[PDB]
Each structure stands twice: as C-alpha cells, then as structure tokens.
Amino acid sequence: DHEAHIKVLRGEPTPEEMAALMAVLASAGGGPAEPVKKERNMWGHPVDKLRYSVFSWQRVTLLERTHMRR
C-alpha cells in the first residue's frame, strides 16, 4: 500500500465526529478539476497570428513545436 491518506494528526474523535468531519470534507472536496474531455482545438491559436521572418528560428522552436506537441 502506497496511497497518501488523510491524517488526523491531533485529537481522538468519536465515530460520529469522524463521520461529521468526513461528510463535511467530502462535500467540500473539489469537483472534476482538470476535466476528462479537454479536447484539442488549435483553430486560431495565437502562434499562428504572429509575423515570422522567413528565416526565423521560432518557425522551428515555437510554431512547429506548438503545432506538433501532443
């Protein structure tokens, strides 16, 4: 077992007070942060708006990098 658990570092609550603590913390706990269906959509990405000199190395290290990074 290698999960990181909640620790009551001080105090010794009764099982009712444990239940109250858990129901509060569990309903306070954040919802679906970092959502599972964050689609990719590169339409109009800011890197395509920039002017690049025809020989600008940022055409490799910014533009192509940004399109191809997955």
Binding site: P15, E16, M18, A19, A20, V24, A28
Partner: peptide, 19 residues
C-alpha cells in the same frame, strides 16, 4: 450514509454545503 470503521451512521447536511 457514512460508515466509520464499518459502523453505519447517517449525516444530515445543509442544502448549500460546499467548500
């Protein structure tokens, strides 16, 4: 319902309990 150590309990929680 909440089970603490396996002991069943029921908990009544405000209609706006969040965070």
């Amino acid at each position: 319902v909440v089970e603490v150590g396996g002991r069943r309990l029921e908990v009544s929680l405000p209609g706006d309990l969040a965070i």
